[PDB]
Write a protein that binds this DNA or RNA. Structure first.
Lengths: 79, 103, 97, 98, 97, 87, 105, 93
DNA sequence: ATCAATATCCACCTGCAGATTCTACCAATGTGTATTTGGAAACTGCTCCATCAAAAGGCATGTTCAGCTGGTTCAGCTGAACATGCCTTTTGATGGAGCAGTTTCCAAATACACAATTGGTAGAATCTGCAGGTGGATATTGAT
DNA sequence: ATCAATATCCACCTGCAGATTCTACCAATGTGTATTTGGAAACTGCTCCATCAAAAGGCATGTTCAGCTGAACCAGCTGAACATGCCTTTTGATGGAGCAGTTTCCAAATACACAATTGGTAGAATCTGCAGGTGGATATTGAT
C-alpha cells in the first residue's frame, strides 16, 4: 500500500501552496484518489512509449511525450 | 553564416534543417527559417528580459527557474501563451484570497 | 571516455541573454527551461504553418506561411512585435542575399 | 504557554510555502508509488532519476493547481473550508470528471 | 383564469428545449452580429451561408455548455438561481478568464 | 462603389428570450436579472476570438469570402472542434 | 481479389488511405502495413458509432439516422463520449438531464 | 469539379450493421468529418512516434501504438485487434 | 491603544560546487544542375447579397405576487495548534551489471515510374420517409 | 380527497422533396528497377538498482478548545407567469454580379549533388555566486 506514502502532511503542504486555509477530513483520501488517476493515466501513456521504443527503461522523454499528450506540457526536462 | 546576414544570434541553418526533417512539408522556402529563427530569437529575448528584471528584484545575478516562472505568470501576453505549461521548479505567484485574510 | 553529440540552444540563448542583460547569468535548470521553450514554440509555429500549407493545397512553406502562423498562434502585442522582427530580418537577408 | 489562534499558522504556512519552489512530497514514497503504478502496466521496468523527478514536478503541479481551483469553489459557498464535493466540482467542470 | 406557480413553466420549458435540436437564437440578429464582428476586423467581407451556420452551432454549443457548468456552480452554492459571479466562476475554472 | 448600411451594437439582437432558451437547454431553472448582459459579454469574447482566427485563414488564402472550412479550422484551433460542415 | 480492401476484407479503401498518409507529410516513407491496419481501425470505429446510433434511431421509431441520434449515441456510451470529448456535433441536441434539487418537492 | 468523401463506404458499413435503416445528409456530413478527425489524430500520433524514435518510416506497428495511445480502453482493444487481424489477412495473399 | 514573546527578517562572511572560460576535434553544413510549384492572367459560373411584401410568430412591456435569496442567530464539533514520542526518509558509499546506446553489415522493403483499367464520382431520375397538421385520449397542476 | 383545465402526448394522413438508385464518364490508381532504412548482431559503458549504516528530521499520535459549519427561521424583493400590443424576423423571389475556382502558360525558386571548412560539441579547468548559518534587527500576534 505505497499509496499511503503520500503522507497527510504532504497533502497539507500541497494545499498550503495552493492558497488554502482549512482542510476537511475526507479530503486526504479524496486527494489520494485523484492523484492516482492522474499518475495512472500519464504513466499508462509514458510506458506505452517505452514499449514502442522496445526499451525496458522508461526515460524522462517518454514522461514528457505523455504529459504533452495529456495537455499538461512540461518544460525543463529535455523537451 | 546566414544569421550574420540577417543579424541574429540564432542559427537559421539549424532551423532550415529542422523544417526539412520534421516533415512539415516538402519544400521549405529560404525565407522561412530566417523569419522563424528571428521570431524565436525575439521571444527568447522577451522572456529573458522580463525574467532578468525579476532576477535583479530578488537580488541575484543567476536566473533560476523561479524567476522565469514569475516573469511568465506575471506578464499577461506571455502568461496567455504558456497557459497549459507547467514550469519545473516554478512555484506559484504568492497570492492569498482576500476573504481568508484575518478581518 | 567516449563522446555522444547532443544538440541544444543554450549557446544562442547565452548570446541573446548577454545582449539583454550584460551583467546577468543563467543556471542549468533555467537553461533547460529556455531550451524546451524554444522547442515547444518552434513545434507549435511550424505545426500551424504545415496545416496552412495543407489547407491551401501547397507543397511549400514560405515565410509568408510562418507569418500567418505567428498571427494565429501569438496573442496581441506579442504578435505585432514578432511579425516585425521577422519581416525585418527577412528584408535584411533579402537585400544582403 | 504560547498558542496561536486557529488559522494563523495556516496563513504564515501559505506565505512561506507559496514563496518557495521546492518539492513538497517525500520523494521515496512517491517513487515507490510510481514504480507500483507502473508494475501493473508492465513488469520489470527501470526509471531514469530524471524521469521520476519529472513526474513529481508534474503531479505537484497538478495538485497545487487543483487546490487553487478548489479553494475558489469553497469560497464560492461562503466557506473557508475545502471539501470532497468542492474537488469533485473542480474536476467536473474542467472536464476531467464525467 | 389559470396561472401556474413559479417554476412549473420553468421545468416544462427545460424538458421541451432539451428534447429538440433546432437553433434557439434567431438567425438574422446572429448574422448581423457576425457581419458586424467581422466588419470591424477586416472590412468588406463575404460570408458563405454555411459559415454563418457553423458559427451559430459553435456558439450556441459553447453557451449551452457554459450554462450547464454555471448551473452546477450555483447549485453548489445551495441556490436554484444563476448569477454572473457563478458564470464567472465557471469561466475562471475552465481557464478562459 | 455602392453603399452599405452601417452596423452598430447588433449584439442586442441576441434577445432576452434567446438567452432564456439557451439557458433552459442547459438545465437551468431560475435566471438572475444581470445574466443577460453578462451572457452577451461572454458570447462576444467567444465570437471575436473565433472569427479573428477564421478571418486570418481567409486572409492567408487571398479570398474575400469566409468559407465554412475557415470557420472549422478556427474552431478546431481553439480546441472546440465542429462536426458536420466539412472537417 | 484485386483491390486491396478485398484482399484484407474491408469496406474502407486501403488505397485512398495510403494516398492520404503519403501526401499529408506524416513521414517520408509509408509502410505497406500502415494504411491497411489504419483503414481497418477507421472502419471499426465507423462501425461502432453506426451500431449505437442505429439502435438509438430504432428507439425513437425512425428509418433514417439523423444527427440527433448520433449525438445521443455518442454521449450515452461512455468510451465514445470520452474520445469525442471536445467535439461538438452539428444539429446535436443534448442528453435530456435535469438536476435533482431543481425538481419539485 | 470532383470532390472525394467516405459517404459510399459509410453506406457500406451501415448496411452491414443495420440492413433496414437509412441515413440523412447532415448526418453523413457528421460521419465523414468524424472519420477525418480521427484519421488526422492517429496518423499524427504515428508520425510523432516516428520522429521520437528517429525513424523515417511509418509502419503498421506505429499506427498500432498510436491506436493504443489515442483510444481509451475497450475500444482500443477491439480496434488494435480488428487491425492486426486485417494486416495479417492482408500479408498472406 | 500599549504591552510582551516568538517568529521572521537581514546582515555579514566563507567556502563549495556548479557556472563559465578555454581547447582542440569534427562532422554538418557555396556553387552548379535539373525540375517544377504556384504566381499571374484570362474566363466561367455559382452563390451571396440586396431587397421586398406579406404572413405571423415571437419579442417587448407592464402588472402582480410567490417562493427564493441572504440576513440573522446559535449549538455542536470538527479541524488546528502544540507538545512529546517514534521511525524511515535522506545521503553518502560502493559495488554489480542490466541495458541503453553506438557501430558495421546488407538484404528485405518501399520509392519511383510508365501503361492499363475499373471503382468512384456527378448528374439525373424517383420514390418512400416523415414533417406538418389536426383531432382526440390522457396526464398534471392547481384550485376548491 | 375531488375537480376541472391547460398542455402534452400519440395516431393517422397527406403532400413534398430529399434520400437513394440508375448511368455513363473518367482519373486515381500491375510489374520492374533503384536506393536505403532498420532490423540484426556485436561491443562498450553509462547510470540505475541494492542493501546498508548513521543522522535527525518529519511524521504520527494525542490532548484541548476555538471558530467554522449548517440547521433553522424570517423579511424583503426580485424574477416568473400572463396576457396583450406591437415589431422584426422569415420566406422566396428575383436580379446582379462580385469573385471563387478552374485552366494554361513561363520562370523564378528550391531540391539535388559534390566539395570544403569552421561554428558548435564535449571535456577539462578555474573561479565567482550564494547557500548555509548564526546572531540581533524588526515585524506580528496575542494578551493587558
Amino acid at each position: 500500500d505505497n499509496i499511503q506514502g503520500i503522507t497527510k502532511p504532504a497533502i497539507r503542504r500541497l494545499a498550503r501552496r495552493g492558497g488554502v486555509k482549512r482542510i476537511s477530513g475526507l479530503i486526504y483520501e479524496e486527494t489520494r484518489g485523484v492523484l492516482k488517476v492522474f499518475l495512472e493515466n500519464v504513466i499508462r501513456d509514458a510506458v506505452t512509449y517505452t514499449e514502442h521504443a522496445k526499451r525496458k527503461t522508461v526515460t524522462a522523454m517518454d514522461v514528457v511525450y505523455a504529459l504533452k499528450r495529456q495537455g499538461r506540457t512540461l518544460y525543463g526536462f529535455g523537451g | 553564416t546566414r544569421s550574420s546576414r540577417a543579424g541574429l544570434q540564432f542559427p537559421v541553418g539549424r532551423v532550415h534543417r529542422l523544417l526539412r526533417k520534421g516533415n512539415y512539408s516538402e519544400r521549405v522556402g529560404a525565407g522561412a527559417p530566417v523569419y522563424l529563427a528571428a521570431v524565436l530569437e525575439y521571444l527568447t529575448a522577451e522572456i529573458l528580459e522580463l525574467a532578468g528584471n525579476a532576477a535583479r528584484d530578488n537580488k541575484k545575478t543567476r536566473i533560476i527557474p523561479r524567476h522565469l516562472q514569475l516573469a511568465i505568470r506575471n506578464d499577461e501576453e506571455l502568461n496567455k501563451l504558456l497557459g497549459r505549461v507547467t514550469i519545473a521548479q516554478g512555484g506559484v505567484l504568492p497570492n492569498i484570497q482576500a476573504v481568508l485574510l484575518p478581518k | 571516455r567516449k563522446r555522444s553529440r547532443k544538440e541544444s540552444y543554450s549557446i544562442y540563448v547565452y548570446k541573446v541573454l548577454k545582449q539583454v542583460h550584460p551583467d546577468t547569468g543563467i543556471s542549468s535548470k533555467a537553461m533547460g527551461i529556455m531550451n524546451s521553450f524554444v522547442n515547444d514554440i518552434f513545434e507549435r509555429i511550424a505545426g500551424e504553418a504545415s496545416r496552412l500549407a495543407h489547407y491551401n493545397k501547397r507543397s511549400t512553406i514560405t515565410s509568408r506561411e510562418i507569418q500567418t502562423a505567428v498571427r494565429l498562434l501569438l496573442p496581441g502585442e506579442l504578435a505585432k512585435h514578432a511579425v516585425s522582427e521577422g519581416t525585418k530580418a527577412v528584408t535584411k537577408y533579402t537585400s544582403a542575399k | 504557554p504560547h498558542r496561536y489562534r486557529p488559522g494563523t499558522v495556516a496563513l504564515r504556512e501559505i506565505r512561506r510555502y507559496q514563496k518557495s519552489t521546492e518539492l513538497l512530497i517525500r520523494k521515496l514514497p512517491f517513487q515507490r508509488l510510481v514504480r507500483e503504478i507502473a508494475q501493473d502496466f508492465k513488469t520489470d521496468l527501470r526509471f531514469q532519476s530524471s524521469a521520476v523527478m519529472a513526474l513529481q514536478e508534474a503531479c505537484e503541479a497538478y495538485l497545487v493547481g487543483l487546490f487553487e481551483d478548489t479553494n475558489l469553489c469553497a469560497i464560492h459557498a461562503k466557506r473557508v473550508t475545502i471539501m470532497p464535493k468542492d474537488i469533485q466540482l473542480a474536476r467536473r467542470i474542467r472536464g476531467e470528471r464525467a
